[PDB]
Design a protein around this nucleic acid. Structure first.
Ligand SMILES: Nc1ncnc2c1ncn2[C@@H]1O[C@H](COP(=O)(O)OP(=O)(O)OP(=O)(O)OP(=O)(O)OC[C@H]2O[C@@H](n3cnc4c(N)ncnc43)[C@H](O)[C@@H]2O)[C@@H](O)[C@H]1O
Ligand SMILES: Nc1ccn([C@@H]2O[C@H](COP(=O)(O)CP(=O)(O)OP(=O)(O)O)[C@@H](O)[C@H]2O)c(=O)n1
Ligand SMILES: [Mg+2]
Ligand SMILES: [Mg+2]
Ligand SMILES: [Mg+2]
Ligand SMILES: [Mg+2]
Ligand SMILES: [Zn+2]
Lengths: 158, 263, 94, 1091, 81, 41, 104, 45, 11
DNA sequence: CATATGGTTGGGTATAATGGGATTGTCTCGGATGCAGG
DNA sequence: CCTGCATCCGAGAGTTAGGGAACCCAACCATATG
């Protein structure tokens, strides 16, 4: 059992999945050039499109692993329960996906690169917001959980 | 009011609070004995009341009392009693203990479920009075004092003291603990096997229960002393006797990581 | 796991009672220098050192093995303490 | 070794000096080399020009000078002194009546001096002043949090230099000000400023009902003086309403230049926001004995225009980096100097009044104690003044570039919300989005970006190349975030032909928003991807393939690497290591072209073309703040010619001028008998055999001989009750000799104390320490420059050295966040080996990769394999460097070498390799129908080789990833952590064991440990923990006596902490009593407290 | 009534556990006014006093158990007879 | 020289006081008490 | 006897005065020359007990076997020094003061 | 933890508090991955 | 109310 | 027990003087409470 | 008169480790020394 850069197998179907989106996006833009869509409708539709594309890419990655490389290290590690979940494999193999602004709203462009292909500078900076938000959440919440545990010990110790 | 090793003195804030109270009380008595006007007496009585308030509970009404040249409020009796650093939570519900140590942990794949690898020097320090008694029993030292002087200097330690130590710990268990202790399985009893080096060896199957890994984690070791304590540790908190989760009833000591991968 | 731990746990209605019995038996054995044991001379817990096989110094191991043999009686309000102590001390002078 | 580098992006400008944030700031603050006639109004000169003239007699400042230090840096280090320079001020005393002048130059004290590398020597210890990020002064307009539609205006001066002023339109419609937590009508103050009804109507009538709501006849009726008195009456209730009192108070509130200061940044911000021309830096002026407005009216105009929805008026982002600024070491020092100078001025006033106007001199008026005290407090007690981290040169360089939101006047670790800890969009190119602490300090301590510069006003600027007509030019402009917001900035990776943008679609940023634009619309371009990240993060190759969390861990861990005696530069570098070595001042470089004359282990003498011989002593075996040994080793021979900037000596953690934090080792990524279970690491004994990962550490022990009431103590060899075996290594003065090996229990310095006829108080080696005694220092009373504390006759210091090899329990890490503790050291014959007999050095568990998502280490391993067989090194810059196809070509050449070498000696393919290739064929790794050589080459191109098990000789059933990896040893060594205690010191009050390894303390059994013991039902163990082992004094004494006598421990008693609790509850006039079953008192004090 | 865990814990009968939990000044002042007696029922109070907790091996159900061998038991039986 | 406070905060976090680093030198240690008892015996 | 209950109650001025072994009349802590507690100070051995085991202040009684002996020359009882952590004192206020716990 | 009737004398309150508190420390809304009503609701309940 | 300096100055 | 020295402590100064110095980036939650309406 | 409704104030916010500024004059008990 070993991990090489080629062990993060990139499915071919992803490419198709990307071009189809680059197609449909243009249509939604036409839907904005004729007044049929508002700001919220266009934003929500773009977000939904990218969400379904991400889900489909995840399914494609795991179908490729199951059908072509049933002994791939990442696939075996996830399937046996030793290490890894489908989202992390999707980020390693398929695509990183949508990112959140520090204000809490999603960006309009997703990160279309996986960790094997390598991110660009802008995508890395865009993901840094979510990374920092997760770190802060952990550090600040662990003390409310500890407080709750203390309160329960004091109410039930007898 | 103690003298530090360098001859300087260290004191508690309570001494300064008491000094202020006594000074104001004496000045009030002097002013009363002199028939001072009622404005001066009223001021002094107000000051005495504030001094008593600061002594009992500083930082409660008005600006807290501080020592000149600093912004630190003086620590009153209420501050001593209450809080996370107060007497109750810091010295009564939890204490620092003797016969304890701490070290970095390393995987112990050759150990059995009920065993842990304990460093030789740590074990010698932890079981020191038992080692002195056993060394007196054998011929290593004529008496406990000579034995202690022998064990004090590193270069004065010989081969037979290690065999005496191995005889001391036979059948006994120690308690291993990793912070934070989130559930009762954060403390577990293990039979110590004396090893070389300065790392504690941990069984792979208890790492999940401890939430432990090997990228710098440290664990603490405690020694139950009496027969009751040893019986409780060997019967109730032994690692091999705690295989199911008390919260869900599911197995908690179970294959993970490399074992699952191989099978 | 400790040998015969399942049988010991099944021998009592509460495991804390087992712990109390084991601790008191270990204390008794330590007090009298293992002269009051119920173990046959070939069931004695042994310990391997360089000189040779000797008796196990750990009294708690002796107590669990003795409980496994089943020759010990335990319960609530069995014998008065004073009586217990006097008879044991007289039979095994210490 | 040949070095090959990837990348297509050329850098028009090099990196700026990496420590300029400290050096430039402090030099601007001091202005030491500027003649006094040409000094600007910044730094301590501004403080002098502000506190003086001290009008009451008049004392006026003329000029200042700084002398030379009394003791060079190294003497300050040895004698625990501060490296400082004397400050002299020339002043004049002028009698307003007579006109006589009394000129005098007075000595004011000492000012610490910054070293060349950017640190300070305070009390002999190296310290760093950390820059502070805070809200910039000025005028801000924010949305009302509660009531929608309304805006609050805020005026903020420099910290501790004026009250915060807020303006707000009340629900009733009137505008109000909230100064010093007191609301009052603003129209009144505007009346005091000399505003008639016509001016206000003509200046604010174009907005709406607002102006009429402000309008009030009652206030306008009373004249300005009456309005001043009214303002005093509302602001200061109770104080008698006197004209002069009110005038002085209001003047000092917002007008006095010595109380209210907006600064230069606040002035700039306010002028740009409100489009005005502030003559000074106050909100109002006092001309001709009357108040002239300066900022209030522009602020009110902006507030009404923003409330009316007029275009061109916007709210402020309080986290925008154009609204936050950096106070550096110079500014903080100048603030503390100003505080001290104000205290000095107050002392001068009191002296003027209390003395005699006839006989007065500048020397008698000035007491310099407050200024020295303020400087000492800042440089010794400020949270921002920190013990400098010098584990390696990169550690110090990183420490010097840190930015902190905490400190005096800053935030509180617990009072900081998500808004300040988040990565703002304006951080791009100014603050590293990756480098930050992991714990409770997340987001509050950060790092300056590599290309960033702090401007004169305190705002971080970033460089961009100007683009004109789709053509990228060489003009580079440094822009603040506010200035940056006005343009469209293209990414640095845009394709270029010459300097023209050869791409129809360009990815760019518009106010932080990603967009796609044509080349014509582009105005600026990024200089490099390197400009986005800090120096530490710029040293991680293949960073674009790593998750941000593990990149954070790797960047932070690079700072903890310990220098090694055989340190190497990484096989794969980013191309920034040399600049790190050069800018840290750790290595030695030739000042001018010349020839080397003398080479030594402690000296290099070079003869320059000027004909001057120059001698550079070498720093050898010096103890850093963290105990690591920093030494310089010569890299030149006598007679060698050296050009300017050529390396002369390598510093610590440096290899031929390249940063060398660890070792390049052969690694295989595979599980191994559970010994690399859960982040553990397996290493080969061959690493220990050739002294890889071997470090040198020096520990300093100190003892003192002082005066006592029972007689003075003596450092002597004559000690009673010890055989001569314990005094072998002691010299005739009672100090261990240089070169003696010392073990725990051995005496280092002998000492005898009067017992009250003498007893042993000697210095001994603590448990777990020891080594070789390398250096002894003795400082006695009266020695020049020595300043002992009163009563202390002498001090003796001993420096003892250790050579630490890698052992089980030590921590290793790579640059991608993979860290682990060494768990097993195998003999060479047990390690997996290549078919040519070469064993691997390190085995890494593959389970650490998939969930951490740090794929950069895999690519590093592949490139390291290629370089290992090709004998070369690589520079792969972040986000523009080696890609997969280039690595594949390098692996193809490496396989050609690795396999043609085998074919030359006359060997074919092994049977075991054939078996592995068959399994690989079934594993869908190789294509069926090719020869074994082709399948082996394809596997090699995937970075995988056939590997043999050293224990059996059979191959591993699958191909294994093998390659060279850069791994460093971390400062977290098991030697410094293993600790145990049976009994020892106890606390004064609670009588409980002390804490800490240094105090020989005990482990804390806290609340949750007690909870776990309770949940086990282990009552007797818990009672032992609470009483017999912590604070039952009689109980613990009896327990120790019984254990050493062979019996069992007795039953415990009441702990002493409960007695302390009872006594403390009685001091609060509360009667606490313990009772038995019949409610009778039970005396727990044994009768010692009953009269 | 229904009350949260904090309010239920601060409203307990034992003033020692409530004082060591939270709101120390209020709990102590109320207990001193009322003259409350702590009966030492729970675990926190016994831990504070350094006693044997009434749980596990310290439970009254099991902690009075005796153990004896057959020889001493028959000797005691003969003495009773 | 004026005395210092036993409650002087050490470190940035509000958890360490000066008096936490001062050992008690008055009460006899368990080793010392055992030595005296054995000497009496 | 075993402790089974702990009672807490308000303390009367009589109870407080019965607790005290003497009133602290001076704010002095220790002498600046000899480092011994000052009479009627915050550390007085007459009120709180001797610093050394079984030994009065002036050294008249420097051995044990004299438990309960109040020195005539110094006024220091002869007992264990540990009583210095148990014995309380009191201050007599010129005017009454309110206990802030019952006010705020 | 034993799959057998509970013994008399067990401190089940401490066990309950620990069992509830342990998961919330880590698994609630552990490292978060930024890729395309937990504890608060429990505390509120 | 608070700040006894103000109260004394007023009196 | 009897002094003799330093250390310690109480008393005194005479143009006229007449109200002080800091304040600042958390967040929620629960009970006490003064104010508005009906 | 009741009620509800913002308003104010007070008490919380996880563990372990390591860390560190007048001067003078005269009487009077205390202690030291023989
Ligand atoms: N808070 C915590 N509570 C309990 N266990 C914890 C813990 N933090 C870590 N651990 C344990 O320690 C293991 C090792 O953690 P690592 O992350 O490998 O190392 P570290 O000891 O945290 O220091 P490092 O120097 O790497 O940290 P950084 O630069 O980011 O930053 C350096 C900072 O780390 C903090 N730190 C180091 N050790 C700490 C500890 N024991 N407790 C709290 N903070 C700690 C210090 O404040 C220091 O300023 C963990 O896997 C875990 O088992
Ligand atoms: N402030 C803190 C920081 C850390 N800790 C403790 O230290 C561990 C570090 O784990 P970690 O962050 O390395 C993740 P790990 O638990 O190993 O998970 P993974 O294998 O699924 O990736 C946490 O899980 C806690 O037990 C703490 O108590 N307080
Ligand atoms: Mg882990
Ligand atoms: Mg860990
Ligand atoms: Mg950390
Ligand atoms: Mg702490
Ligand atoms: Zn006496």
């Amino acid at each position: 059992i070993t991990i090489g850069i080629d062990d993060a197998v990139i499915p071919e179907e992803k490419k198709q999945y990307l071009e189809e989106a680059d197609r449909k996006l243009l249509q939604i833009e036409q839907a904005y050039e004729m007044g049929f869509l508002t700001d919220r409708e266009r934003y929500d539709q773009i977000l939904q499109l990218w969400t379904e594309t991400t889900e489909k890419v995840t399914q494609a990655v795991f179908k490729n692993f199951e059908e072509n490389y049933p002994f791939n290290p990442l696939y075996v590690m996830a399937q046996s329960g030793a290490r890894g979940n489908p989202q992390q494999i999707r980020q390693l193999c398929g695509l990183r996906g949508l990112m959140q602004k520090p204000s809490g709203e999603t960006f309009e462009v997703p990160v279309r690169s996986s960790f094997r292909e390598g991110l660009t500078v802008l995508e890395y900076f865009i993901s840094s917001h979510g990374a920092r938000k997760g770190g802060a959440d952990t550090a600040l919440r662990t003390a409310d959980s500890g407080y709750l545990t203390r309160k329960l010990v004091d109410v039930t110790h007898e | 009011m103690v003298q530090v090793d360098g001859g300087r003195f260290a004191t508690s804030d309570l001494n300064d609070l008491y000094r202020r109270l006594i000074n104001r009380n004496n000045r009030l008595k002097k002013l009363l004995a002199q028939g001072a006007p009622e404005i001066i007496i009223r001021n002094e009585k107000r000051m005495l009341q504030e001094a008593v308030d600061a002594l009992l509970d500083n930082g409660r009404r008005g600006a807290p009392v501080t020592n000149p040249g600093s912004d630190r409020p003086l620590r009153s009796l209420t501050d001593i009693l209450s809080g996370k650093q107060g007497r109750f939570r810091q010295n009564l519900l939890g204490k620092r203990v003797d016969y304890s140590g701490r070290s970095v942990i390393v995987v112990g794949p050759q150990l059995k479920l009920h065993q842990c690898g304990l460093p030789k020097r740590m074990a010698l320090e932890l079981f020191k009075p038992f080692l002195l008694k056993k060394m007196e029993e054998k011929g290593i030292a004529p008496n406990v004092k000579a034995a202690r002087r022998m064990l004090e200097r590193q270069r004065d330690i010989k081969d037979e003291v290690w065999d005496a130590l191995e005889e001391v710990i036979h059948g006994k268990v120690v308690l291993l603990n990793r912070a934070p202790t989130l559930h009762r399985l954060g403390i577990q009893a293990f039979q110590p096997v004396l090893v070389e080096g300065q790392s504690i060896q941990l069984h792979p199957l208890v790492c999940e229960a401890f939430n432990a890994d090997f990228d710098g984690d440290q664990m603490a070791v405690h020694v139950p002393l009496s027969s009751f304590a040893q019986a409780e540790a060997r019967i109730q908190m032994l690692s091999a006797h705690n295989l199911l989760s008390p919260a869900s009833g599911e197995p908690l000591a179970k294959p993970s990581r490399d074992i699952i991968l191989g099978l | 796991a400790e040998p015969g731990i399942d049988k010991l746990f099944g021998m009592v209605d509460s495991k804390y009672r087992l712990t109390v019995v084991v601790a008191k038996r270990a204390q008794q054995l330590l007090r009298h220098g293992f002269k009051n044991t119920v173990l046959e001379p070939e069931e004695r817990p042994k310990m391997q050192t360089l000189e040779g096989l000797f008796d196990d110094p750990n009294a708690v191991t002796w107590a669990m093995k003795e409980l496994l043999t089943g020759r010990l009686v335990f319960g609530e309000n069995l014998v008065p303490e004073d009586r217990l102590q006097k008879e044991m001390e007289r039979l095994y002078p210490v | 070794m040949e070095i090959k580098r990837f990348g297509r992006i050329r850098e028009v400008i090099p990196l700026p000096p990496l420590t300029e944030i400290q050096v430039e700031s402090y030099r601007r603050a001091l202005q030491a080399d500027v003649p006094p006639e040409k000094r600007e109004n910044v730094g301590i000169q501004a403080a002098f020009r502000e506190t003086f003239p001290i009008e009451e007699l008049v004392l006026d400042f003329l000029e200042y000078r700084l002398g030379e230090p009394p003791f060079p840096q190294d003497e300050c280090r040895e004698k625990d002194l501060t490296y400082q320079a004397p400050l002299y001020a020339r002043l004049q005393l002028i009698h307003k009546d007579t006109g006589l002048i009394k000129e005098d130059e007075v000595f004011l004290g000492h000012i610490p001096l910054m070293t060349e590398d950017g640190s300070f020597i305070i009390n002999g210890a190296d310290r760093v002043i950390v820059s502070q990020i805070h809200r910039s002064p000025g005028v801000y307009f924010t949305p009302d949090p509660a009531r929608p539609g309304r805006y609050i205006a805020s005026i903020i001066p420099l910290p501790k230099r004026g009250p915060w002023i807020d303006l707000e339109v009340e629900p009733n419609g009137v505008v109000s000000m909230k100064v010093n937590k007191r609301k009052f009508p603003l129209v009144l103050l505007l009346r005091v400023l000399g505003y008639d009804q016509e001016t206000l109507a003509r200046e604010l009538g174009a907005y709406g009902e607002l102006v009429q709501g402000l309008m009030d006849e009652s206030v306008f009726a009373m004249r300005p003086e009456e309005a001043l008195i009214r303002l005093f009456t509302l602001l200061r209730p109770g104080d008698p309403p006197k004209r002069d009192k009110a005038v002085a108070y209001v003047y000092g509130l917002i007008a006095d230049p010595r109380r209210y200061d907006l600064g230069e940044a606040g002035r700039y911000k306010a002028e740009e926001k409100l489009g005005i021309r502030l003559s000074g830096r106050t909100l109002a002026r006092f001309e001709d004995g009357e108040f002239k407005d300066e900022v209030f009216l522009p602020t009110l105009r902006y507030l009404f225009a923003l409330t009316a929805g007029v275009p061109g008026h916007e709210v402020d982002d309080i986290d925008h980096l154009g609204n936050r600024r950096i106070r550096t070491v110079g500014e903080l020092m100048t603030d503390q100097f100003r505080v001290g100078l104000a205290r000095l001025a107050r002392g001068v006033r009191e002296r003027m009044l209390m003395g005699s106007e006839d006989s007065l001199t500048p020397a008698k008026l000035v007491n310099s104690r407050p200024l020295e005290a303020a400087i000492r407090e800042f440089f010794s007690r400020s949270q921002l003044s920190q013990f400098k981290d010098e584990t390696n040169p990169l550690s110090s360089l990183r420490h010097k570039r840190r930015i902190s939101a905490l400190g005096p006047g800053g935030l509180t670790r617990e009072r900081a919300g998500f808004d300040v800890r988040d990565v703002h969009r304006t951080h791009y190119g100014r603050i590293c989005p990756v480098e930050t602490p992991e714990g409770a300090n997340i987001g509050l301590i950060t790092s300056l970006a590599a290309y960033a510069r702090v401007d004169e006003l305190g705002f971080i600027r970033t460089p961009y190349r100007r683009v004109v007509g789709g053509v990228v030019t060489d003009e580079v402009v440094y822009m603040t975030a506010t200035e940056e917001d006005r343009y469209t900035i293209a990414q640095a990776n845009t394709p270029l032909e010459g300097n023209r943008i050869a791409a129809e679609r360009v990815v760019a940023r518009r106010k932080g928003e990603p967009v796609i634009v044509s080349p014509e619309e582009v105005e600026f371009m990024d200089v490099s991807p390197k400009q986005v990240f800090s120096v530490n993060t710029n040293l991680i190759p293949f960073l674009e393939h790593d998750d941000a969390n593990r990149a954070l861990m790797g960047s932070n861990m690079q700072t903890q690497a310990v220098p090694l005696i055989r340190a190497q530069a990484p096989v794969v570098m980013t191309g920034l290591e040399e600049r790190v070595v050069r800018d840290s001042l750790a290595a030695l470089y030739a000042e001018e072209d010349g020839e080397v004359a003398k080479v030594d282990g402690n000296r290099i003498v070079v003869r320059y073309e000027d004909g001057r011989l120059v001698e550079y002593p070498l720093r050898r075996f010096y103890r850093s703040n963290q105990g690591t040994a920093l030494d310089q080793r010569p890299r030149v021979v006598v007679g060698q010619r050296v050009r300017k900037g050529d390396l002369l000596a390598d510093g610590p953690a440096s290899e031929n001028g390249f940063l060398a934090l660890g070792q390049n080792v052969l690694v295989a990524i595979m599980p191994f008998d559970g010994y690399n279970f859960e982040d553990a690491i397996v290493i080969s004994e061959e690493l220990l055999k050739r002294d890889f990962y071997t470090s040198i550490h020096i520990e300093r022990y100190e003892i003192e001989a002082r005066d006592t009431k029972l007689g003075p103590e003596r450092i002597t060899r004559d000690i009673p009750h010890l055989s001569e075996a314990a005094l072998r290594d002691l010299d005739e003065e009672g100090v261990v000799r240089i070169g003696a090996e010392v073990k725990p229990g051995d005496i280092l310095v002998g000492r005898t104390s009067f017992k009250g006829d003498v007893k042993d108080t000697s210095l001994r080696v603590p448990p777990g320490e020891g080594g070789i005694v390398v250096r002894t220092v003795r400082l006695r009373r009266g020695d020049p420059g020595v300043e002992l504390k009163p009563g202390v006759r002498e001090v003796v210091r001993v420096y003892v050295a250790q050579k630490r090899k890698l052992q089980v329990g030590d921590k290793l890490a790579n640059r991608h966040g993979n860290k682990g503790v060494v768990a097993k050291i195998l003999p060479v014959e047990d390690m997996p080996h290549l078919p040519d007999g070469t064993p691997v050095d390190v085995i890494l568990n593959p389970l650490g990769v998939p969930s951490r998502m740090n794929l950069g280490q895999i690519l590093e391993t592949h490139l390291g394999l290629a370089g290992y067989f090709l004998g070369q090194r690589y520079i792969s810059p972040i986000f523009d460097g080696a890609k997969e196809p280039e690595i594949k070509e390098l692996l193809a050449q490496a396989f050609e070498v690795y396999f043609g070498k085998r074919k030359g000696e006359g060997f074919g393919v092994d049977k075991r390799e054939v078996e592995v290739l068959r399994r690989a064929e079934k594993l869908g790794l190789v294509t069926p129908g090719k020869t074994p050589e082709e399948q082996l080459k394809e596997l090699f191109l995937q970075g995988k080789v056939v590997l043999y098990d050293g224990r059996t000789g059979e191959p591993i059933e699958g191909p294994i990833v093998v390659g060279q990896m850069f791994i460093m040893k971390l400062y977290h060594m098991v030697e410094d952590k293993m600790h145990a205690r049976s009994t020892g010191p106890y606390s004064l009050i609670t009588q409980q064991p002390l804490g800490g390894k240094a105090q020989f303390g005990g482990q804390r059994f806290g609340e949750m440990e007690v909870w776990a013991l309770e949940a086990y039902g282990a009552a007797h163990t818990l009672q032992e923990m609470l009483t017999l082992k912590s604070d039952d004094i009689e109980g613990r004494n009896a327990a120790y006596e019984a254990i050493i006598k062979g019996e069992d421990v007795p039953e415990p008693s009441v702990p002493e902490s409960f007695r302390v609790l009872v006594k403390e509850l009685q001091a609060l006039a509360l009667d606490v009593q313990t009772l038995d079953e019949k409610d009778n008192p039970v005396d727990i004090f044994e009768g010692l407290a009953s009269k | 009534l229904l009350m949260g865990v904090t309010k239920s814990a601060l409203s307990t009968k034992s003033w020692l556990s409530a004082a060591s939990f939270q709101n120390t000044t209020h709990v102590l002042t109320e207990a001193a006014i009322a003259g409350k007696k702590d009966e030492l029922i729970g675990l926190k109070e016994n831990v504070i006093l350094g006693r044997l907790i009434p749980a596990g091996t310290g439970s009254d159900f099991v902690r009075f158990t005796q153990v004896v061998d057959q020889k001493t038991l028959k000797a005691i039986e003969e003495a009773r007879k | 020289q004026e005395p210092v406070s036993l409650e002087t905060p050490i470190g940035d976090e509000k958890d360490s006081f000066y008096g936490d680093f001062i050992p008690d030198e008055h009460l006899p240690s368990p080793v010392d008490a055992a030595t005296q008892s054995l000497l009496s015996e | 006897k075993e402790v089974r209950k702990v009672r807490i109650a308000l303390a009367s001025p009589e109870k407080i005065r019965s607790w005290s072994y003497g009133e602290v009349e001076k704010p002095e802590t220790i002498n600046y020359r000899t480092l011994k507690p000052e009479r009627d100070g915050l550390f007085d051995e007459r009120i709180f007990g001797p610093i050394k085991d079984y030994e009065c202040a002036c050294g008249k009684y420097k051995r044990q076997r004299f438990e309960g002996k109040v020195c005539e020359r110094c006024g220091v009882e002869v007992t264990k020094s540990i009583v210095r952590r148990y014995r309380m004192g009191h201050i007599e206020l010129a005017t009454p003061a309110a206990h802030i716990w019952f006010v705020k | 933890s034993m799959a057998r009737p509970v013994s008399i004398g067990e401190a089940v309150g401490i066990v309950a508090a620990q069992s509830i508190g342990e998961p919330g420390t880590q698994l609630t809304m552990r490292t978060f991955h930024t890729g395309g009503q937990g504890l608060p609701r429990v505390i509120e309940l | 109310t608070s700040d006894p300096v103000r109260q004394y100055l007023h009196e």
